[PDB]
C-alpha cells in the first residue's frame, strides 16, 4: 500500500537456510541504528525471473549489469527447468531486437557466469548464448564468453572434450550455418576458422583434434548437410589437402566389423536402428 | 610537426610562447587568468607527451 | 642542516643498532663488527657513529648539481662505515655457521643504501671503487635487495658519472617476487642518458614474457603494477632510444588488459581499494601505452593478431578510463582514436 529497498534489506536473509517467515553491523565506524546487524525473525510454496528480466528492462542499465553479477550469486529440473530455457531463447532474442551493445554486454556477461555455474541443460543454453554472441557484433561480449571458455577450462579444448556430444551439437549448429552460408572459397576461410576455434580452445588447429573424430561429426553432419556444407567442407577439405561406423550409426539414429566393434546406436537404440 | 626539423622549429616556437606565458602568468593578481592559463597549458603539454612522453 | 639533519642519518644508523636492529636481525651491526683489521673497522664505526654525533657531515656536500637532484648530505666519516662494509664483504669471502653474515651483509646494504642517503660523497667514493662495491658486483632475495641499495645509489650517481656506473657491473646476463622486486634498470632508465645503447638489445622480450607468466606466487596488484612502471619505463626508454619482442610485452600487457576495466566493471565501484586505485592508474597507463604503441607504428599489425582479444577487454576500459580519476585525457585522446 505504502527505504522500501532497505525494506528488502530487512529481510535478505544469508546464512545456510532462509527464515522468510518471521540495524547496525558489529564492525565500528557506522553511526546508524547503533549496533544491531542482527534481524529479528524452506515452505514448498521461473516466474519470478521474468519479473527480473522485466526490471533490467525498466532502466536497470549499470544496475541491470549489477543484477547480472548477482545472478551470477543467484544461479549458485523439469518445468522449472523449461521456463529457465524458453527465457534464455527469449533473451537473446531480445537482445537481437534491441540491437544495443550495452545490452549484448549484460548478456555476454550472463554467458561469463554460465560459464562459470552452467548446469548441463543450461551449459546447451551457454552454447546458444555463444552462438548468439557470434552473431552478436560487441566482439567485447564474445571477450565476455571466452571469460565462460575459461570458467569451463576451469581450458576451452578440455571443456570441449567434457562437452562432447553437446560441443559437437554447437559446430553442427555452426555446420547448419556453413549450409545456409553454401562459397567454396568462404568455405575453405571457414575451414580455416574451424582450426581458429581449436585455437580457441587450444587444441592446436583441427586436425588431431579433428580428422577422424571430427569425421565421425562429419558423418551426423553430411546427412543434416545434403551437400551444402557438406559439399562445401569437401570443397575446403580439397584446399586443405589435395570406415565410416559414425555414419553407419548415424543412419542407425565381419561385414561392417568396425561398425559391428563399436555399435553404439546398434547396442542402445535397438529397434528399428537394430533392424537398419 | 611529423617532420623532425619541423619539430625542433615547434621547441622554439614554444619557448618564444612561453616567455609571453611568463609575463602573463604574474599576471598584476589575476587568479582566474592563472587557472584558465594552466589548462591550454596542459592540452599544450598532453601535445608534447603525444609526439613522445620523452 | 647541521646537527638536525645530522640526526636522521644517525637515526638510520640507530635501526641498525635497534634490536633486532632493523628487519629483526639479530645484529645490531656494531654487534655484528663484535680479524684485527675488522676489530679495528669496528673502532671506525664508533668513530663514524661519533661523526654522526657531530653533525658536521649534515650540509655537507652542498652542491645538488649532476648528482642525486637536491644534495645528499657529507655524511663524511661514511668511508669509515664503507671500511666496516669492506670487513663485510671480506665476511663470506670463501662463499663468493655458513653465510651467517649474508643476512648481516645484506642488512650492512641496507645501512649502505641509508649512507648513500647520507653522502652524496660517499656514492662517489663506491664509485670511484666502493672497492667492495665493485667486488660485490663482481660477486638471493637480500642480493636483490643490495641491487636495490646500488639503484638508491645510481639515483645519488650524477648523470654520466651514473653511465660509468652501469659500465661497472660485469655483465647484462649477471644484472638478469624479490626478483620481481628487483626488476621493478627502472632505475637507469630513471637516469636518463648514456647507456640508451646498452638498453638496446640483440633479439627484455623474455622479461616482458614473465610479466605475462606473473610467475610470483603474490601476484599482488601493486607488484603488477610496478611491473607495470617497469614496462612504462621501458616505454620511456624506447622514446628516448628513438617489434615482435614488443608485442609478446604487449601480449603480457594484454592478459593484464583483459582483467583491467573488465574487473573494474565486475565491481562497479570508485576504486577506493589501493589496489583497485592502483589499477585505475594502470588504466591510465594502458590508454598512454596505447598512444605509445601507435607511436610506434606496422606496430598495429603485430598488435592486431592478439587485438581482438585487446579490443573486447579496451570497450570496456575505453567506457572505465573515461569515468576513472586516474585516466587522463592524454591517455584518453589514443583511447578514443582506438574508438
Not at chain 1, 571466452?146 to 559446430?171: D, G, N
Not at chain 3, 627502472?186 to 622480450?205: G, I, K, Y
Request: with cysteine; hydrophobic share 45%.
Amino acid at each position: 500500500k505504502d527505504v522500501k529497498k532497505e525494506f528488502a534489506s530487512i529481510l535478505g536473509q544469508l546464512v545456510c537456510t532462509l527464515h522468510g517467515m518471521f540495524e547496525p553491523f558489529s564492525e565500528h565506524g557506522h553511526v546508524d541504528l547503533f549496533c544491531r546487524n542482527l534481524k529479528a525473525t524452506q515452505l514448498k510454496a521461473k516466474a519470478v525471473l521474468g519479473t527480473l528480466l522485466n526490471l533490467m528492462e525498466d532502466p536497470d542499465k549499470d544496475v541491470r549489469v549489477a543484477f547480472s553479477g548477482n545472478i551470477k550469486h543467484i544461479l549458485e529440473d523439469g518445468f522449472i527447468k523449461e521456463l529457465f530455457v524458453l527465457r534464455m531463447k527469449e533473451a537473446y532474442t531480445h537482445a537481437q531486437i534491441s540491437r544495443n551493445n550495452e545490452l549484448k554486454d549484460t548478456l555476454i556477461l550472463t554467458t561469463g557466469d554460465i560459464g562459470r555455474a552452467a548446469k548441463g541443460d543450461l551449459v546447451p543454453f551457454a552454447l546458444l548464448h555463444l552462438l548468439h554472441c557470434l552473431l552478436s557484433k560487441s566482439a567485447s561480449v564474445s571477450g565476455a564468453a571466452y571469460t565462460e571458455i575459461r570458467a569451463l577450462v576451469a581450458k576451452l579444448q578440455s571443456f570441449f572434450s567434457q562437452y562432447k556430444k553437446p560441443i559437437c551439437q554447437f559446430l553442427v549448429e555452426s555446420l547448419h550455418s556453413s549450409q545456409m552460408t553454401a562459397v567454396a572459397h568462404q568455405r575453405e576461410m571457414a575451414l580455416n576458422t574451424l582450426s581458429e576455434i581449436a585455437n580457441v580452445f587450444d587444441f592446436p588447429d583441427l586436425n588431431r583434434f579433428l580428422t577422424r573424430t571430427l569425421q565421425v561429426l562429419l558423418p551426423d553432419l553430411a546427412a543434416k548437410a545434403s551437400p551444402a556444407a557438406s559439399a562445401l567442407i569437401r570443397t575446403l577439405g580439397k584446399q586443405l589437402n589435395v570406415f565410416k561406423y559414425i555414419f553407419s550409426h548415424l543412419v542407425c539414429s565381419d561385414f561392417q566389423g568396425l561398425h559391428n566393434e563399436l555399435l553404439l546406436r546398434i547396442g542402445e537404440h535397438y529397434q528399428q536402428v537394430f533392424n537398419g | 610537426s611529423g617532420s623532425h626539423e619541423a619539430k625542433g622549429s615547434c621547441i622554439e616556437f614554444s619557448n618564444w610562447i612561453i616567455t609571453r606565458l611568463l609575463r602573463i602568468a604574474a599576471t598584476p593578481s589575476c587568479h582566474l587568468l592563472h587557472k584558465k592559463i594552466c589548462e591550454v597549458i596542459c592540452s599544450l603539454l598532453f601535445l608534447f607527451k603525444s609526439k613522445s612522453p620523452a | 642542516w647541521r646537527q638536525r639533519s645530522n640526526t636522521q642519518g644517525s637515526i638510520l644508523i640507530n635501526l641498525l643498532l635497534k634490536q633486532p636492529l632493523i628487519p629483526g636481525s639479530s645484529l645490531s651491526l656494531c654487534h655484528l663488527l663484535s680479524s684485527a683489521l675488522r676489530e679495528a673497522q669496528n673502532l671506525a664505526f664508533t668513530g663514524l657513529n661519533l661523526v654522526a654525533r657531530n653533525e658536521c657531515s649534515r650540509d655537507g656536500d652542498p652542491a645538488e648539481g649532476g648528482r642525486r637532484a637536491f644534495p645528499l648530505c657529507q655524511l663524511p666519516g661514511a668511508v669509515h662505515f664503507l671500511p666496516l662494509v669492506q670487513f663485510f664483504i671480506g665476511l663470506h669471502c670463501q662463499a663468493l655457521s655458513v653465510c651467517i653474515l649474508e643476512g648481516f651483509s645484506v642488512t650492512a646494504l641496507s645501512i649502505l643504501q641509508h649512507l648513500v642517503c647520507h653522502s652524496g660523497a660517499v656514492v662517489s667514493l663506491l664509485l670511484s671503487g666502493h672497492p667492495l662495491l665493485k667486488m660485490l658486483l663482481h660477486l638471493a632475495s637480500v642480493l636483490t635487495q643490495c641491487l636495490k641499495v646500488l639503484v638508491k645509489l645510481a639515483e645519488n650517481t650524477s648523470c654520466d658519472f651514473l653511465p660509468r656506473f652501469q659500465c661497472v657491473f660485469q655483465v647484462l646476463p649477471k644484472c638478469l617476487p624479490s626478483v620481481l622486486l628487483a626488476v621493478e634498470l627502472s632505475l637507469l632508465a630513471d637516469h636518463d642518458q648514456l647507456a640508451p645503447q646498452l638498453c638496446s638489445h640483440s633479439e627484455l622480450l623474455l622479461l616482458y614474457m614473465y610479466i605475462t607468466s606473473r610467475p610470483d606466487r603474490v601476484a599482488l596488484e601493486t607488484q603488477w603494477l610496478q611491473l607495470e612502471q617497469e614496462v612504462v619505463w621501458l616505454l620511456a626508454k624506447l622514446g628516448v632510444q628513438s617489434c615482435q619482442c614488443n608485442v609478446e610485452v604487449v601480449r603480457a600487457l594484454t592478459v593484464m588488459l583483459h582483467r583491467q576495466w573488465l574487473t573494474v566493471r565486475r565491481a562497479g565501484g570508485p576504486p577506493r581499494t589501493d589496489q583497485q586505485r592502483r589499477t585505475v592508474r594502470c588504466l591510465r597507463d594502458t590508454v598512454l601505452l596505447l598512444h605509445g604503441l601507435s607511436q610506434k607504428d606496422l606496430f598495429m599489425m603485430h598488435c592486431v593478431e592478439v587485438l581482438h582479444q585487446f579490443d573486447q577487454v579496451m570497450p570496456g576500459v575505453s567506457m572505465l578510463i573515461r569515468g576513472l580519476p586516474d585516466v587522463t585525457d592524454c591517455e584518453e585522446a589514443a583511447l578514443d582514436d582506438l574508438c
